[PDB]
Design a protein around this ligand. Structure first.
Ligand SMILES: Cc1nnc2ccc(N3CCC(C)CC3)nn12
Ligand code: NA
Length: 124
């Protein structure tokens, strides 16, 4: 079955708009989003649709770019590192649930390299 997706709002959580978080939405996320390999990551993994009944029996901190995009648009993060950690969790989840050489893993590897290329230099 599917668990509920990660939260994109939390009224008690402190939030910030920074130049780096603006950039993570305008440049980093919106560039990755258009990549030919982005589509499996644009929404939470649907274990019922995709017939992966063990996905959430294995993956305990799910993350995806649709959640990340909604968090950025909702001003959910305190700083850029928090959002970067969500991207890293998304990539590592894919490596954990699958194995080397899988098509989905090749996709994640390419996106992760583009991601790191984009956050190598951030605005001040
Ligand atoms: C996201 C994600 N993380 N692990 C997986 C395993 C499979 C999967 N799908 C099947 C094939 C893929 C090209 C698209 C959907 N997605 N997936
Ligand atoms: Na950059």
């Amino acid at each position: 079955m599917n668990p509920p997706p990660p939260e994109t709002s939390n009224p008690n959580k402190p939030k910030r708009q920074t130049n780096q978080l603006q950039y993570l939405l305008r440049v980093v996320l919106k560039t990755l989003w258009k990549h030919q390999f982005a589509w499996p990551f644009q929404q939470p993994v649907d274990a019922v649709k995709l017939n992966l009944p063990d996905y959430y029996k294995i993956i305990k901190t799910p993350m995806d770019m649709g959640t990340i995009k909604k968090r950025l648009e909702n001003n959910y993060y305190w700083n850029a590192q928090e959002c970067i950690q969500d991207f890293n969790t998304m990539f590592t989840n894919c490596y954990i649930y699958n194995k080397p050489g899988d098509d989905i893993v090749l996709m994640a590897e390419a996106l992760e390299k583009l991601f790191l290329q984009k956050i190598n230099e951030l605005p001040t």
